[PDB]
Amino acid sequence: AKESLCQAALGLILKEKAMTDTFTLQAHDQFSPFSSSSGRRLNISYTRNMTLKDGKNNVAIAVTYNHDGSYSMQIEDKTFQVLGNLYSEGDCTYLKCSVNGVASKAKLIILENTIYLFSKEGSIEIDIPVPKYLSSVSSQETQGGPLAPMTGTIEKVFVKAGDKVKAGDSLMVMIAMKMEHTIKSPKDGTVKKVFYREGAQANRHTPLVEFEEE
Amino acid sequence: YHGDSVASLGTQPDLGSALYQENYKQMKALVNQLHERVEHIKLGGGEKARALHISRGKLLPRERIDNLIDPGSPFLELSQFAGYQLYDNEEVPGGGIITGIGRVSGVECMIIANDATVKGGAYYPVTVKKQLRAQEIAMQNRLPCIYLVDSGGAYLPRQADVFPDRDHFGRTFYNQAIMSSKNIAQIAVVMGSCTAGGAYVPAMADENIIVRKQGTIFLAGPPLVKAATGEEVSAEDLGGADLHCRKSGVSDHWALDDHHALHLTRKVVRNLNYQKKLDVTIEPSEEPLFPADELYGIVGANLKRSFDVREVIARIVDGSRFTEFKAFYGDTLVTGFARIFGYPVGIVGNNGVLFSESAKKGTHFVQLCCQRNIPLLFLQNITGFMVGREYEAEGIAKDGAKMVAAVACAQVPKITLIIGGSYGAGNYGMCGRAYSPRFLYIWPNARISVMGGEQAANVLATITKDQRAREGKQFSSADEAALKEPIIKKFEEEGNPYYSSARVWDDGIIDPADTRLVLGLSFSAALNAPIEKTDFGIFRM
Amino acid sequence: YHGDSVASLGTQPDLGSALYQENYKQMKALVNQLHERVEHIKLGGGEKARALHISRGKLLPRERIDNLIDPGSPFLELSQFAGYQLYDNEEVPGGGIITGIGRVSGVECMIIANDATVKGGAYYPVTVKKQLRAQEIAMQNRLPCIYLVDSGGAYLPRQADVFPDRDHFGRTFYNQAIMSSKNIAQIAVVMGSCTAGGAYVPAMADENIIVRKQGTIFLAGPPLVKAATGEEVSAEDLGGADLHCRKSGVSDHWALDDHHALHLTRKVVRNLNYQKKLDVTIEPSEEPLFPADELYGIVGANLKRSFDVREVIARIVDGSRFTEFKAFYGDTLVTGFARIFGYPVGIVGNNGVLFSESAKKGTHFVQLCCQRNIPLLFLQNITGFMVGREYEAEGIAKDGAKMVAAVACAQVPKITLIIGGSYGAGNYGMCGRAYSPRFLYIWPNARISVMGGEQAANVLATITKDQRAREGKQFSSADEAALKEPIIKKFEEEGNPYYSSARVWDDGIIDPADTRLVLGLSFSAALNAPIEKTDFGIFRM
Ligand SMILES: CC(=O)SCCNC(=O)CCNC(=O)[C@H](O)C(C)(C)COP(=O)(O)OP(=O)(O)OC[C@H]1O[C@@H](n2cnc3c(N)ncnc32)[C@H](O)[C@@H]1OP(=O)(O)O
């Protein structure tokens, strides 16, 4: 439970430290203190706060990079004193860590977006967040409404004033002066109305079809 | 072949000795006091400004820096005590700006961020000084720099100290142009509105990122436009990420939230296509043989007692291995070669009052290190200087000049640390702030001033005594203590480490325990700049 | 630190869409046609010449190249369609010469071999042009070159086009001297008789190998000597491997059969003592996330329909990872950074009719890449150009000049690919053939000409209409189609990819599927030449 969340949060750092270590090895200078994963600031104790998905409820974990190498994390006014390491049996790596004086070993398989803790007594499932900008939802939020790149005669519109909108469907075909280009629907929401009728022309960066808010 | 064993420096201080106990207690008191103050500074502008800054959806500057750097990496803040009680009644935590060096996408780079919480991100005179110091550090070390602008503009009530002078505001842009000229990268990130101070910065930088709503790039603010041209319009119409991106083209990228801007910045740094290369022999590094905290009991908080430098050197260098150079001759000064974090260094330190022989030894050592391309580190505790009729007859001043010339003409990176009291022209001799060391730090105990207070009081007493005797009413027996007391008090106030660190004479105040770590970081960054030829002026015999 | 995930370009095209089916069918037709023609070219001079060449014991040129290169390695032939129907009635497969780049003994080197089967190895004008193009490629890329001479001499019936002019025959020797001057190696191998064309080449080269019987080095052939000096003697007495080796010393080595000559050549290349070094950051490479053949359905064989460039970029770059630069501004043009086979590249592509803003964006991008030493790749589909009264009022031509100046002054390697129709001055703008790109290729669909046929027909109609109206008998309503038709037909003929590739305006016609592979090879070779400083002329504001 609460300890299990800490165990996974430790695993992210250890994997990140090791991958931080690997790039150091190929580098010219593998001796600088910068390569150290200490995360130490001058006169201040560095703290980073996490968020991990735990079934229905998100949990925020506050990781303070302690001065000695011990690892301090706190979730709902319960603190946990954690120290751990990564060692591999065969080809699979085990996570050995002690939380508040209790230590155990568990397989640590790490996917792209999920955290795996494997143990004799049971298994634990933790999910890493996905940034919204990386989720491509931000990509559709870049443009508020459709814009016509160039002025041209609209041959015909595939969508009526009120019509269902499918992904990939073309709003209209607009051909102009040695160029035909096909305008798509920016968003899957049902059209509020179509701005331009057949045969009309819209300038560069001009609205073409109104869409309901998603 | 590297099988020869080497003698190691340092011994075991007698813990039971009452002197060690006393020195330890003093050093703890100083370190504790420093820690509490640094906490209070890091709180920033205060709870209310934090509440408002959060309310706008922005991320607090400390959070921004933590997210930006490669996570799980050290970060080296500089001059945190800027503006400490410097002004009459205005609280300016951290000089209203956070500057430092960090590793991003595997490449070291300097981060400079405004603190809109503190006084709306106005540029106090100290703020400009701090920022310019950071930029010059980056250029000498040849490091890319990143700006996080959330500033309004120059502080109006003090315009004389900001706008006009050569080293004043605006020199920032000149440095920016020079940096971009010689391939040193520039990146600007916009999170807040800017009025002619953070307006040229994005235009001045090669790359640009601006948040969708909270970011607005405009040369003149809505009140400035309304007051000047008689026309009022919101800064978004002049600024705005979308508005500037679609048409103006000032913004090279368009981010939605603060996190998105940080992530894009990482991508750009990776694409920057730079590779670091070294030009010095490197070796495996091992920890010093003795605990660092013992330095407290060794040093204490009294300038009167003396501590041998070699104890400190043993506490610092790798494996506590050292090779003294010309040990018996000029014993008052110590020089030698050592290795720190696998890098070769030349250590120069002070034990006592300088003499002519010590100056000659230092000059010879400097020539050797410059010839062999070895970085230099200085540990100055100048309790006294070279003064005496016999000394000046043989031109001890001339030998001091030899120190000055050798230090000034040197081209290898130099780092200086003020372990003990610094006074007199020796500050000039042992690579003072004026002599452009790449860095400079002071322990919490050190006091720096031109002269000890007692000396100046005596000198003033004598000159007034002589002239007033010529005036017929000599400096009487009375008023002697009355005249002496203010001089002693004033020199004590000006010599305080916090007082100097309030200005930017030093890069920071560090406890002795962290010393070793800091040095390694500094030297690593300094190695980015390729070493160059060292040319010496006339060596006056 | 390189742990940040990056958004990937491209989507999944709707296969079921009838448009995709139609585009796929067109692209298959073109690719099939190209393949059949290339087969017929590779047969060479014909069965009878092959029978005779075998009868002499020589190895056919294709066999020679296969044996020479490091076995199991790619080889990149160039301009295979040279002389395709170029002359009136003379079949000249491959221009009577085979040129290419290959890896020999671990070192890249350019191979140039005559084809004595085709017209006795006579130098047609196109043959000289092809060979000189190869040599200039080798010099810019700084690569060793190897010659396999089996040529007779210049084609007599066309002596004006071969001998006299500056870029005509004989310039070969000048390039050879310059190459050997600046340490670029030269190797000549002789398998057949030579008359004043392959006579200076061995003397001009540093190293020389000649087969025992079939090789004869002589400045004047037996018929030339008999006709000129009135004295007849066999070319062996003037040539011969043994005869030249014992006394003349023209031959540095003496081989018995063709295989022996090839083996000796490998030995010499190994002894050449050269090592390749890179000066750009390199990273592991991974395949693009989407199949390449989808490009067919994406592109089709009609110039009217438009395809977004980012689809193609996703089909090409490593991992389909891309970072667009100033995306919203100047959307008609696309720029950004990517990595191909572990090498950094800057991609510039066209989506539509250029405007002033696009030109400014391109200029800024070019400056960045030149500053950071990043190679550049161009994907031009210029359906239309910048023409309009409002455009010319704001000096859109001036912005086009900014494109031209930035491209011309650039010094980093540049590669160009004509994915779509190229017309107008944009060819000059986007690193055309005249602007010395290191390479240039065209897809089977692209059409290149100064202007579309319809435009020229309209312009000619108007000018004749105006002048003839001034003449009193204006261009009548009749003859309008009669005048238009020939112009359209002629422009279509001159725009055909085979027509341009018949000449040496392009380095080759490649199907879209192979695209990625070819690029990697090209860039690797281009990295041999060390990068240099880029200096820019006056930037007219
Ligand atoms: C270069 C020039 O001379 S132009 C200078 C005039 N332009 C400005 O700076 C306008 C004021 N600043 C702004 O509004 C900036 O755009 C912002 C958005 C970054 C600051 O955001 P805010 O915090 O909302 O501005 P606000 O006015 O509340 O600033 C808070 C405080 O900073 C002070 N301040 C901020 N900028 C300046 C400035 N340029 N000069 C003097 N004081 C300033 C204000 O007096 C204010 O007083 P307080 O700290 O006692 O409350």
Ligand SMILES: CC(=O)SCCNC(=O)CCNC(=O)[C@H](O)C(C)(C)COP(=O)(O)OP(=O)(O)OC[C@H]1O[C@@H](n2cnc3c(N)ncnc32)[C@H](O)[C@@H]1OP(=O)(O)O
């Ligand atoms: C550079 C100068 O101007 S020097 C003057 C040129 N001198 C010559 O080349 C004389 C001609 N020499 C030849 O006959 C041949 O080139 C040889 C002997 C050197 C070797 O050529 P081979 O491959 O054996 O061809 P072969 O001698 O069997 O027949 C000659 C063929 O090559 C052609 N050919 C070769 N060289 C030339 C040339 N310089 N000019 C015109 N045609 C030539 C002939 O037209 C003939 O054509 P074909 O292929 O239709 O039969």
Ligand SMILES: O=CCCCC[C@@H]1SC[C@@H]2NC(=O)N[C@@H]21
């Ligand atoms: O009888 C006329 C034939 C022309 C002979 C030309 C002489 S022969 C030697 C010399 N070499 C040449 O190429 N031309 C001259």
Ligand SMILES: O=CCCCC[C@@H]1SC[C@@H]2NC(=O)N[C@@H]21
């Ligand atoms: O009707 C057909 C005439 C062809 C127009 C070509 C367009 S017009 C603007 C642009 N500039 C060119 O040179 N070509 C395109």
